[PDB]
Write an enzyme that holds these catalytic residues in place. Structure first.
Site, PDB file in Angstrom:
ATOM      1  N   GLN A 178      45.975   6.487  28.302  1.00  0.00           N
ATOM      2  CA  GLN A 178      45.487   7.128  29.532  1.00  0.00           C
ATOM      3  C   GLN A 178      46.563   7.658  30.449  1.00  0.00           C
ATOM      4  O   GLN A 178      47.587   7.013  30.697  1.00  0.00           O
ATOM      5  CB  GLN A 178      44.622   6.099  30.270  1.00  0.00           C
TER       6      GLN A 178
ATOM      7  N   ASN B  92      37.481   7.583  35.240  1.00  0.00           N
ATOM      8  CA  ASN B  92      36.889   7.659  36.578  1.00  0.00           C
ATOM      9  C   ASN B  92      36.773   6.264  37.196  1.00  0.00           C
ATOM     10  O   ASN B  92      37.053   5.270  36.526  1.00  0.00           O
ATOM     11  CB  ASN B  92      35.523   8.344  36.575  1.00  0.00           C
TER      12      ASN B  92
ATOM     13  N   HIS C 261      31.473   8.421  30.770  1.00  0.00           N
ATOM     14  CA  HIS C 261      32.680   9.228  30.863  1.00  0.00           C
ATOM     15  C   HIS C 261      32.392  10.584  30.241  1.00  0.00           C
ATOM     16  O   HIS C 261      31.796  10.637  29.156  1.00  0.00           O
ATOM     17  CB  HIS C 261      33.852   8.521  30.150  1.00  0.00           C
TER      18      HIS C 261
ATOM     19  N   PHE D 197      42.169   1.194  21.362  1.00  0.00           N
ATOM     20  CA  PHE D 197      41.264   1.645  22.412  1.00  0.00           C
ATOM     21  C   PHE D 197      41.642   3.082  22.810  1.00  0.00           C
ATOM     22  O   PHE D 197      41.007   4.013  22.294  1.00  0.00           O
ATOM     23  CB  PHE D 197      41.308   0.689  23.601  1.00  0.00           C
TER      24      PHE D 197
ATOM     25  N   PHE E 190      41.743  10.273  29.307  1.00  0.00           N
ATOM     26  CA  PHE E 190      42.168   9.431  28.178  1.00  0.00           C
ATOM     27  C   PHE E 190      41.903  10.103  26.830  1.00  0.00           C
ATOM     28  O   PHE E 190      41.010  10.946  26.656  1.00  0.00           O
ATOM     29  CB  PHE E 190      41.531   8.049  28.269  1.00  0.00           C
TER      30      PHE E 190
ATOM     31  N   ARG F 291      48.733   3.850  31.491  1.00  0.00           N
ATOM     32  CA  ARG F 291      47.857   2.791  30.986  1.00  0.00           C
ATOM     33  C   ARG F 291      47.528   3.046  29.518  1.00  0.00           C
ATOM     34  O   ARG F 291      46.922   4.047  29.132  1.00  0.00           O
ATOM     35  CB  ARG F 291      46.608   2.677  31.839  1.00  0.00           C
TER      36      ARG F 291
ATOM     37  N   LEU G  81      31.243   3.954  25.903  1.00  0.00           N
ATOM     38  CA  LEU G  81      31.514   4.762  27.082  1.00  0.00           C
ATOM     39  C   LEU G  81      30.613   5.992  27.149  1.00  0.00           C
ATOM     40  O   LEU G  81      30.730   6.747  28.121  1.00  0.00           O
ATOM     41  CB  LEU G  81      32.970   5.238  27.125  1.00  0.00           C
TER      42      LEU G  81
END
Length: 172
Positions: A70, A109, A133, A67, A120, A62, A129
């Site tokens: 991952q 998660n 995270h 951004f 990531f 991903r 975040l």
């Protein structure tokens, strides 16, 4: 105390693209840092999954432009899998470090206390975040290799080709 150093050698569509070197914050999140360290070395062998507890040969499944990239799903390879050395899920250690810029290394998660093996690498500051995270490290060499993987991402998250962790381990 003493911060661990780990690496990924990356391939993109099968071609050698360089080495990412990460420093971990053992001193701030020893449990979180140790899990990732052992997954780079592969030292705990075969997991409950029946698969190696090892990032080697896994991919960035991903990848989202501007951004993050991952990875870490070495059981399903799609974001639905992964396993910690502790045995699948472990709580959020603490939220002391923040998502302050590119190169920040953090745990993926599925809500509170769901840490496994998926992680990531941020390519931007992702302050939304913080407190959600667990940040446990930073890129210290090879940020260009990170950008290279990023250029293969889509808004949708699906990569345009296989970005693999061809080799990995602990340095020194």
């Amino acid at each position: 105390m003493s911060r661990s150093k780990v690496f990924f050698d990356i391939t993109i569509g099968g071609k050698a693209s360089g080495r990412i070197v990460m420093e971990l914050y053992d001193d701030v999140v020893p449990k979180t840092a140790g899990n990732f360290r052992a997954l780079c070395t592969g030292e705990n062998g075969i997991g409950k999954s029946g698969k190696p507890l090892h990032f080697k040969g896994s991919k960035f499944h991903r990848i989202i432009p501007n951004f993050m990239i991952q990875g870490g799903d070495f059981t399903r390879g799609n974001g639905t899998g992964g396993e910690s050395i502790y045995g699948e899920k472990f709580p959020d250690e603490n939220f002391k470090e923040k998502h302050t810029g590119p190169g920040v290394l953090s745990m993926a998660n599925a809500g509170p206390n769901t840490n496994g093996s998926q992680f990531f690498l941020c390519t931007v500051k992702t302050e939304w975040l913080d407190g959600k995270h667990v940040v446990f490290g930073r890129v210290v060499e090879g940020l260009d290799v990170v950008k290279a993987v990023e250029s293969n991402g889509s808004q949708s998250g699906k990569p345009v080709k296989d970005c693999m962790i061809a080799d990995c381990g602990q340095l020194k």
